[PDB]
Amino acid sequence: GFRDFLLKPELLRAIVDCGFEHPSEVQHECIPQAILGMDVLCQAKSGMGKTAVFVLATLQQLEPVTGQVSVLVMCHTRELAFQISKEYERFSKYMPNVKVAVFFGGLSIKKDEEVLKKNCPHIVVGTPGRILALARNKSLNLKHIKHFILDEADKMLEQLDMRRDVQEIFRMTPHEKQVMMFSATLSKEIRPVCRKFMQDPMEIFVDDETKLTLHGLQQYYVKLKDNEKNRKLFDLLDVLEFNQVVIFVKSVQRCIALAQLLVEQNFPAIAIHRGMPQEERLSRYQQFKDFQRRILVATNLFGRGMDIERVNIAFNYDMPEDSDTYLHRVARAGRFGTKGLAITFVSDENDAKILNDVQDRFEVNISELPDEIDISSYIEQT
Predict the structure, then answer these.
(1) What sequence ranges are listed for the domain Helicase ATP-binding?
(2) Which of 212, 245, 264, 376 has its CA 20 to 30 A from that of 186?
(3) Annotated binding residue at 46?
(4) Residues 227 and 180 in one domain
(5) In this structure, what CATH number is given to the domain that contains residue 323?
């Protein structure tokens, strides 16, 4: 997969360890030029292995120097800065001397200062505000920066205030270095600042995945109190036939409890919730590619959409927050298989509103669950 990207062996091993030897389109279009030190302006769509583009291209060109920060990555939200760093750590699994740190508000800047004095990293990730503050006070020397990366450019550059800070941070770095910008949207603010930031960038515009359909799919709902869901769900798992099931819940506490309960009821199930390291979520999801019955209890997976041929039933044990989560939660997108069954639990006079909203957006009707469902209307070959 990534072997054709001509990446240091240690990077390929870590990539194999993260469980995916199949590059996305944004990567096929960006990693090659990125790897060569070319400036890049890429308008894509979060996820899709977008940040892996700069994490990899950057690790590939990294000329590690103790005490020197050679890579600066900035983005708008601290959760994304946090996530981008854990990813640098992951793909850096076999590059023992490579160092990374993330900085943002919420934690005492004095803590960021120590790290920079005692054990400066080669790679820094952070939000503009905290980065600009650490630079101004000299704690962070940005004079050796060879790779300047901006993620969520549109959001960072939208407000005059943050764009100003970003331009101040920029001027603090060597005029000669590679600069890359990734933005889900290409506002007429990035266009200006880029003339300032980039020279003659490779401008790459990857699409917006183009998906989201409920065609040829059986969809029903059941109204009941949370008090009944388990009993209903369990009654249902006994009647309905399936190769693999997916149950969506609202929280982590709920995911952990339901999964455990199913497991104790001889209903082999794995749990995947927003409250565990990406590595664990990625590993567990990957694992869920094997068995004759298997059940996955999740709070939400990966945007890619249901890609497990054998998954015949998607449950909304908890009503999706919005009519968009539904689309993602339920929809085929793998090799073959277009048939599937979707069942939603309605316990609130509020869920209905959300459910009623769904039938409009995609203009499809979701009936009340019938006593009889033809096994072949939602399970294609058997």
Answers:
(1) 31-204
(2) 212
(3) yes
(4) no
(5) 3.40.50.300
